[PDB]
Design a protein around this ligand. Structure first.
Ligand SMILES: NC(=O)c1ccc[n+]([C@@H]2O[C@H](COP(=O)([O-])OP(=O)(O)OC[C@H]3O[C@@H](n4cnc5c(N)ncnc54)[C@H](O)[C@@H]3O)[C@@H](O)[C@H]2O)c1
Ligand SMILES: NC(=O)c1ccc[n+]([C@@H]2O[C@H](COP(=O)([O-])OP(=O)(O)OC[C@H]3O[C@@H](n4cnc5c(N)ncnc54)[C@H](O)[C@@H]3O)[C@@H](O)[C@H]2O)c1
Ligand SMILES: NC(=O)c1ccc[n+]([C@@H]2O[C@H](COP(=O)([O-])OP(=O)(O)OC[C@H]3O[C@@H](n4cnc5c(N)ncnc54)[C@H](O)[C@@H]3O)[C@@H](O)[C@H]2O)c1
Ligand SMILES: NC(=O)c1ccc[n+]([C@@H]2O[C@H](COP(=O)([O-])OP(=O)(O)OC[C@H]3O[C@@H](n4cnc5c(N)ncnc54)[C@H](O)[C@@H]3O)[C@@H](O)[C@H]2O)c1
Ligand SMILES: Nc1ncnc2c1ncn2[C@@H]1O[C@H](CO)[C@@H](O)[C@H]1O
Ligand SMILES: Nc1ncnc2c1ncn2[C@@H]1O[C@H](CO)[C@@H](O)[C@H]1O
Ligand SMILES: Nc1ncnc2c1ncn2[C@@H]1O[C@H](CO)[C@@H](O)[C@H]1O
Lengths: 430, 433, 432, 431
C-alpha cells in the first residue's frame, strides 16, 4: 500500500541539500553518471536495496535511476537511517520504506515492501548490506529467484554468509562480493571507521579521549582504523586479538595486546570490532571502571551482551537517544551506546560521503556487471576484476588533486604490466 | 517595580536532561569536585556575588555549582550567541541561579542577558567578575564604572581577553585587580591545545559530516589552538597547511611536517579552513574567491574578525541555510562556500565545545583565582596577575588519579641535588613546559 | 690457484660477529624455535643449500639454523655493499663456506656466487635460497645441468618473485619455487616496519642530516614506500609521494601525503627515496632541478631506479666524503649527494632491517626449504606461496618475546566464525 | 698550552673538512652571522675558551666565531662526544683543539685546562660552555681570571640550573647569558634534535628493533617528549616517569602511560634517562629488567644510572663494540649499557643534526657578541637573549626550509598591539 514511509517528509528540503553536498563529495558516483548515463545499462532492471538509508545511499539510489533502473529501498539497521535523506528520496517517487527508531517488526516489514515493485513485477536484481534481504528472499519464499539475475553484497559479515551459503544449495542467484574489493575493504573498513567512530562517541558522550585508557577488540581493518583514531587523540589503546598475525601488527604499531579480562579492568572506553559473538561479557562489565563507555562498531549487536546488563543492572537511565547509563549493583556506572548496535550509524551519520563513493561505485559496477554479463557470471561468489577495482580508485584522485604518474613504455615492459592497467598481481594485499 | 525574570532560558523542561549530563560531567571533572571537598565546608566565597559571562555549557554548570557550594551567589550569561547548551542552562536555572542564555541569540539579547547579571536578587551590585572574552569586563568598565569600587576581583579565561586586559592596564583603563587564567600552564597548554584537538573536528563533522582524509586543509596560526587543530586534521589523514606571522611558530610547524605558506596560496589548494589567530582579516574576499567548490570555512579564535562574513553575505548570488549554523554561499563564479557558525567559534557553535575533563583544568584555576581575589584581596593589585606555580601544579595533581597516573616522589637526595622541594615548586618560572 | 674455501675481509672480526650473533639470536625467537623443534629430526639432512642473501648478522643466524636442521650451507651476498664483515668472518670461522665482503666489485660479486655452487663434497647444490634472483638466474643461464638436482628454490624479495612469475609464464622455470616475500609474515612486516627503521638509519649513518623540516620525495607507496614515508613523516619531514597505481595513490592521500610526479618533486624535495622496483625513477631531468646538496637514495632491489651512470657521465666533479657517501658537483655548481652508488641504502650505508623483523622473514625461509626438500610432490614446477597455517605459525612464534597475550576463541565463537580454534583464522583472499 | 693542540688523529682532517662543508650548507644561521658580522669583526680582541662536544657542528660554530675576529681555543664537555675527524680539521686550521673520543677523566680535565691561557700567554676573556665544567673550573680553580672575563654563555639545562644556583650563592663572577632557555634552543634542540639523535645512537650501538618493544622514558621535559615521540613513531610502546605533575598530565594526554620506574623496569626492554637527576635507574630496577635490556642516558652527566653497581655486582662484562657493554647478571639475565651511561646520541652516534644545531649555535654567537660588545647592558647574573633576537634566530632558518611567512598589515599589527617586525609575543609566552 504505502508508496513510502519515512517518518517526516517535511525533511525532504534539508535532505536534497545534503544530497547535493554529498554529490560534490562523491565524485565516483558522479563519474559513473557521466560515463554510464548516456547508455543507461540498468534499464528494465528493478532492484530492491537494503542499505543504511543515508544521504550517501540517496546518491547511489539516484545514480542507479539515472543509469536507468527502477529502485526500491529499505535500511539494513534500525538506527542507520537518516530521516532527512529518507523523505528526499521518497519525494522523487523512488519507493523507500525506512526511518530512525525502527522496531525489529518495522524493520523487516519494510523489506517486504521493497520486494514488490510499483509496476508489480517481482524483481531482477538485489543490492544488500548484511544478509537480511538476501536471506529473506531465500528463507522466506524463493519463487522469484529465477526471474532475477544476480545479487550484490557489501558487509564482510554478509559476505561471510554468502561464501558459506555456497557450501551447499544456497545461492540460487549469481553474486558479486563488493567488500573484498580493495577500494572497499581497505578504505571503508579502515579509513571510514577512523572518522565515524569517535564522532559517534562524542555526540553521545562528549567524552575526552586524551589520557583515557581505551580497549579495541579486534585489530582487523575496522580495528586498525578505530585504534588509530583514539591513539591520535591522546588515547592509550589496548588491543584484543585472536589471530596471531593481526596481534603482531598491533604490537609492531605500539599497541599492547592482551585479553578483555585484563583490559576490562584497566580501560574506560570500549569498542568491539571482531564480528564475533560475546566480546564483552558479564565478568568484563562488572570489572570496568565507573561510567565506562561501551560501544560496538561491528555488524550485529552480539558483540556485547546487552541482555545481561539490562537484567543485572540496578537502574537503567536514558540520558538521550541511544545513550543508556546503568547503575550496577556494585555502584559503578556503565554507559552503553546504541544498545550495542552499529555505533557510527546510531550515534552519528556513518562514514563520510567520500569514502562511500568508493564503496557504492564498486556497487554500481557490480550491478552493471551482473545484468549486462550474466553469461560471464555463474551462480556463486564472484569478486570484481582488478582493472575495475583500480577504476573506482582512479575516479576519486582528481577530487583529491592527485597527479598520477603514467608508466613509460620501456618502464611497463620492465614491470610486465600494461600502461593502462592492471598494475598488481591478484595476490597483492596493498 | 518592573519585575525581572528570575532567568531567561530556551526551555525550562530541559532541566532533567541537563542534570543527567551534568552528573556524567562531574565524574569526568575531578578538579572541580576536589575544590568542593577542600574549601566547601569553609565557605571561602561567602559574601561574594560573582557575575559570569562564559559560554553556558554543561562544564560551566559544574563550575557554577562549585562556586555556589563554596558560598557564592552566582548569576550567569554566555560570551557567545551560539555557545550555550540549552539543557545545561535550564538545569542551572532550576537551581535558583539567575542565568540568561540560549542558543540562537541575537546580538541584541546577548547584551541584554549580560546586563541582567550585574545586579543580584537583593538589588546589590556584583562584587566579582568571571569572564571569557572581555565583554562583561568592558561593559562594567565602559558603562558601569560605578560598580568597580566594590568589585574586589576580575578573572579572565581566554587569550584574546587577556590581551585586552593587559593593554587596559597599559592605558590606565583597568580599575580592578585581575588574574590571567589562560596563562596558567594547566589551561594554556591543555585547554587551548588538547581541547581544540578534539573540539574542532567535532564542530566540522556535526555541521558537514566531511571526510578529513585526502583533503587539503589550512590552519591560520600555529599557536596553542593551531597546534591542536593541525594535529587533529593530520591524524585524520588531512594534509594541513599552516599560516604564521611569528618565525618561531612557523619553524615549529615546519619541523613537524607542515608546509607553511601564505593564505593567498592556500585558498587555491585547500578545501577546509580553520582560523585560530585572534587576528582580523585572515580570510578576505580574494581568499574566498580563490577557494575550491564547497570549501568549508570556520573560525576557532574568539570573535568573528578573522573571516569577512560581511563581504560574503553581501557579495553572493545566493545564500542557503542547510541547517542551523551551517550556510552555503553560491558565489558569482558558480562555486560554493560552506561557512560554519557565521564566522563564530565553530567548536561551541556547531558542537558542545571542549571536553569536560580538560575544562576541569581551566575551571579549577578559575575557582582558585576567585578564592585568591576574594579571600586574599589585599595581597593583589590593580594590575594583571597570574596564579603561583605552586597553584598551577596543584591543578594538575588533582587530575592524575582519574587517568591512572602514578607520579614518582623525589628522594631527599634527589631534591637537594636539583635544589627543589619534594612538594614543589618543581620548575623555574620561565619554564615553558 | 685453488678453491679458497672461504674469502672474507678480515677473519679477525670473528669474535665481534659471534658476540653480535648471540644478541641477534635473542632477538629472533622464530629461528631459535626452529632449531629446537626441527633440530632433532634433521629435515635438511642431505640438502646442499646455496644461498645468495645479504651477509648480515641476521643472515648468520639463518645459516646456522639451516645447519642445525641438517643442511650443508654455502653463501654469497646478493649485493656488494650489504655484507657485514664481522658476520661473514664468524660464519667462515665455523667452517661454513662463505664468499662475502663489503666493498665488492661486480666481477668479484659473480665470482662469489660461482664459488657457492659446488660444495666441499664435490657435489653441486640441490637447493637454492635467493634474494634478487641472481643466483637463480645464473644457475638457469650459465649452469642449466644443475637444475635436475635442484629440488627447489625460495625467493625473499618482491623483484625476484616478479622474475620468477615471468619465468613461469614463459617456459623458463626449471624447478619448483616458493615465494617467501608474499607470505603475509614477510611483506607486511619486513618491507613495512623493517624499512621504517632501516631507511632512516642508512641516511643518518651516511649523512647525519635532519629530517625535521625537510621536503622528501618517496617514489612508490608499496610496502617499502609506506614504511619509508611513515618514518620520515615521524621525524618531521613532509613526504611527497609518486605513484603509478591508483589504489596506492589513494591510500597515500588518505595518509596525508601529497601525490604528484617526480618532475615536480625534483624541484621542491631535498631528500629522495626510490621504492618502486622500476627503472628510471630519477633521471637527468630530475637531478638537474634538485636543490643544492640534495640526498638521493634507493631502497629498491637493484640500482636501476636512478641514473648513476649519467651522474657519473655529466657531472663536473665527484668527491668521496666517506665509503658509500659521494658528493657530485654538477655543471650548475649545485651539489648532489648520492648514497651507496644507488644500491640499497639501508644495507649499504647501515646494517639493514633489525633482527626481530628478520626472524619473521627468515622463519618463513627455513619453512620453505623444509617444504621443498621434504615434500617435493605437492610442489610442482611453478611459483607457490606457503600455506596460511604456517604463515600464522611464523607470527605465533614471535608473540611471547613482545609480551602479547593472545585470545583463545571459545568453541561457541569459533563455530560462529566458522574457524578452527587453531586456525587458519582468515580466508586466503584476506589482504590483512 | 705547551702542546698547542692534542687531537686523536690529525690525519683525518681532510675528511672532517669535507664533512664540515656539508654541515655549513645545513647551518644558515651561522653562515648569515659570518655574512652580517664578517666585515665588522665585532668579536675582535676576543679570546674565547669553549667546552662543547668537539663535533662537525661545533666546528662550524668555532670557525664562525673566528670569522668574527675572535681567537678561540676549544675542549670537549664529554669524554666520548668528540668526533675525531672534526677535531683534526680544526686542529690543522691553527685553532687549538684539545679533545679526542674516549678520553679519560684525568685527560678530560687536562684538556680544558690548556684552553684557559692562549698561545701568547694571555688568559681568556670569554667563556662558552656546555655543562658548566669549564665555568666551574675557572671559578673554583684559577679564579684570578674572572675579572678579565667579560661574560659566559651556556647551552645546557644542567649548566643553567648550576648557573642560577651560583647566583643565589653569590659565586657567579661574570654576567652569564642562558642560551639554553632561548625558545629557539629549548623547543627545537632539546626536542626535535633528541628525537633524531637518540634513535641514531641506539641503532648504531645495538641495531635493535623499536617496533613491538616496551620502552621507558624517565622524564617528560624537552628531551623526554622528543625521546618518547621518537620511539612511539617507530612502533614502540613508551612508559613515562615523572616527578612533576604538569609534565605527567602532558604525557598522559599524549597516550603515554605514566608510572614508576619500579613498575616499568619490569616490563620494558629499552630504558633512556632524560631527567638531569641522580639515581633514576638503580640496582633494584636493573635486577627486574628483562633479559638483554638496553639502558641509555641522554642527560648531560652520567648520574642517572648507577654504573658503579653494575660493574661491581655483575658476573661478567663483555665489550661488543666501543661504548657497548653486555653485562651478565648473577640471575643469568643480560643488560646492555650504552656508552657507559654517558650521553648516547653523542657517545654512540654523532649527536643532533646540523640544522637544529644552527638554531642553538646562532643563539650562542649572538650571546657572545652581546657580552663582548654590549658589555654594559649586562651585570653579573644569569640572563637570556631578547625576544627580538630569539625571533631572528628562527627567521634566519625559514628560507632553507622553504617557509613563506605571513607579513601583517598595519591594521592587523596595531590591532594585535604589535610591530610588524616583532617582538610578536609576550615574554611569558611558552610557545
Ligand atoms: N560500521 C561500519 O561501517 C563497518 C565497516 C566495515 C566493517 N564492519 C563490520 O565490522 C565487522 C568486522 O569487520 P572487518 O572488516 O574488520 O573484518 P576483519 O576480519 O578483518 O576483522 C575482524 C578481526 O577480529 C578478530 N576476532 C575475531 N574474533 C575475536 C575476538 N573474540 N577477539 C578479538 N578479535 C577477534 C579476527 O581475528 C579478525 O581479524 C564485520 O562484521 C563488518 O561487517 C562495519
Ligand atoms: N574556541 C575555543 O575553544 C578556544 C580555545 C582557546 C583559545 N581560543 C581563542 O583562539 C584565539 C587564539 O588562540 P591561541 O591560544 O592559540 O593564541 P596564540 O597567541 O597562542 O596563537 C595565535 C598565533 O596566530 C599568529 N597570528 C597572529 N595574527 C596572524 C595572521 N594574520 N596570520 C597568521 N598567524 C597570525 C600569531 O603568530 C600567534 O602565534 C584567541 O582568540 C583565543 O581567545 C578559542
Ligand atoms: N631495502 C630492503 O630491505 C627491501 C625490502 C623489501 C623489498 N625491497 C625491494 O624494494 C622494491 C619494492 O618492494 P615492494 O614490496 O614495496 O613492492 P611493491 O609492489 O609493493 O611497491 C612498488 C610500488 O612502486 C610503484 N611504482 C612502480 N613503478 C613506479 C613509478 N615509475 N613511479 C612510481 N611508483 C611506481 C608501484 O605502483 C607499486 O605500488 C622491490 O625491488 C623489492 O624487491 C627492498
Ligand atoms: N643529549 C643531548 O644532546 C641533550 C640535549 C638537551 C638537553 N640535555 C640534557 O638532558 C637533561 C634534561 O634536559 P631537559 O631540557 O629536558 O630538562 P627538563 O627540566 O625540561 O626535563 C627534566 C624532567 O625530568 C623530571 N624529573 C626530575 N627529577 C625526576 C625523576 N627522579 N624522575 C623523573 N622525572 C624527573 C622533571 O620533572 C622534568 O620535567 C639535562 O641534563 C640537559 O642538560 C641533553
Ligand atoms: N565546553 C566548554 N565550556 C565552556 N567553555 C569552553 C568549553 N570549551 C571551550 N571553552 C572555552 O571557550 C573559550 C573560547 O572562547 C576558551 O577559553 C575555552 O577554554
Ligand atoms: N639486516 C638484513 N639482513 C639480511 N637481509 C636483510 C636485512 N634487511 C633486509 N634484508 C633483506 O634484503 C632484501 C632486499 O633484497 C629484503 O627484501 C630483505 O629480505
Ligand atoms: N651534535 C652535536 N654537536 C654539538 N653539540 C651538540 C650536539 N648534539 C647536542 N649538542 C648539545 O649538547 C648539549 C647537551 O650537553 C645540548 O644543549 C646540545 O645543544
Amino acid at each position: 500500500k504505502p508508496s513510502y514511509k519515512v517518518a517526516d517528509i517535511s525533511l525532504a528540503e534539508w535532505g536534497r541539500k545534503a544530497i547535493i553536498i554529498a554529490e560534490n563529495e562523491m565524485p565516483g558516483l558522479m563519474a559513473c553518471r557521466k560515463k554510464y548515463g548516456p547508455s543507461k545499462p540498468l534499464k528494465g532492471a528493478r532492484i530492491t536495496g537494503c542499505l543504511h538509508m543515508t544521504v550517501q545511499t540517496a546518491v547511489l539510489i539516484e545514480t542507479l535511476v539515472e543509469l536507468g533502473a527502477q529502485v526500491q529501498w529499505s535500511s539494513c539497521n534500525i538506527f542507520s537511517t537518516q530521516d532527512n535523506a529518507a523523505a528526499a528520496i521518497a519525494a522523487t517517487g523512488v519507493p523507500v520504506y525506512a526511518w530512525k527508531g525502527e522496531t525489529d517488526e518495522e524493520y523487516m516489514w519494510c523489506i517486504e515492501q521493497t520486494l514488490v515493485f510499483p509496476d508489480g513485477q517481482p524483481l531482477n536484481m538485489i543490492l544488500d548490506d548484511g544478509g537480511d534481504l538476501t536471506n529473506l528472499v531465500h528463507e522466506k519464499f524463493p519463487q522469484y529467484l529465477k526471474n532475477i539475475k544476480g545479487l550484490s553484497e557489501e558487509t564482510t559479515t554478509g559476505v561471510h554468509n554468502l561464501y558459506k551459503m555456497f557450501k551447499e544449495g544456497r545461492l540460487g542467484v549469481p553474486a558479486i562480493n563488493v567488500n573484498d574489493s580493495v577500494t572497499k575493504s581497505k578504505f571503508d573498513n579502515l579509513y571510514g571507521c577512523r572518522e565515524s567512530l569517535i564522532d559517534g562517541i562524542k555526540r553521545a558522550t562528549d567524552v575526552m579521549i586524551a589520557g583515557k585508557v581505551c580497549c579495541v577488540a579486534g585489530y582487523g581493518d575496522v580495528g586498525k582504523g578505530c585504534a588509530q583514531a583514539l591513539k591520535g587523540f591522546g588515547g592509550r589503546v589496548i588491543v584484543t586479538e585472536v589471530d596471531p598475525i593481526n596481534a603482531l601488527q598491533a604490537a609492531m604499531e605500539g599497541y599492547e595486546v592482551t585479553t578483555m579480562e585484563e583490559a576490562s579492568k584497566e580501560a574506560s572506553i570500549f569498542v568491539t570490532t571482531t564480528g564475533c559473538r560475546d566480546i564483552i561479557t558479564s565478568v568484563h562489565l562488572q570489572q570496568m571502571p565507573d561510567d565506562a563507555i561501551v560501544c560496538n562498531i561491528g555488524h550485529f549487536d552480539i558483540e556485547i551482551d546487552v541482555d545481561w546488563l539490562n537484567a543485572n543492572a540496578k537502574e537503567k537511565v536514558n540520558v538521550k537517544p541511544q545513550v543508556d547509563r546503568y547503575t550496577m549493583q556494585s555502584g559503578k556506572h556503565i554507559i552503553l551506546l546504541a544498545e550495542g548496535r552499529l555505533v557510527n550509524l546510531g550515534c552519528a551519520h556513518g562514514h563520510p560521503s567520500f569514502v562511500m563513493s568508493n564503496s557504492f561505485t564498486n556497487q554500481v559496477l557490480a550491478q552493471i556487471e551482473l545484468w549486462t554479463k550474466s553469461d560471464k557470471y555463474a551462480v556463486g561468489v564472484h569478486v570484481l576484476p582488478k582493472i575495475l577495482d583500480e577504476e573506482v580508485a582512479s575516479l576519486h584522485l582528481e577530487k583529491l588533486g592527485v597527479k598520477l604518474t603514467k608508466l613509460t613504455e620501456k618502464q611497463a615492459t620492465y614491470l610486465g604490466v600494461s600502461q593502462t592497467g592492471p598494475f598488481k598481481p591478484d595476490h597483492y594485499r596493498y
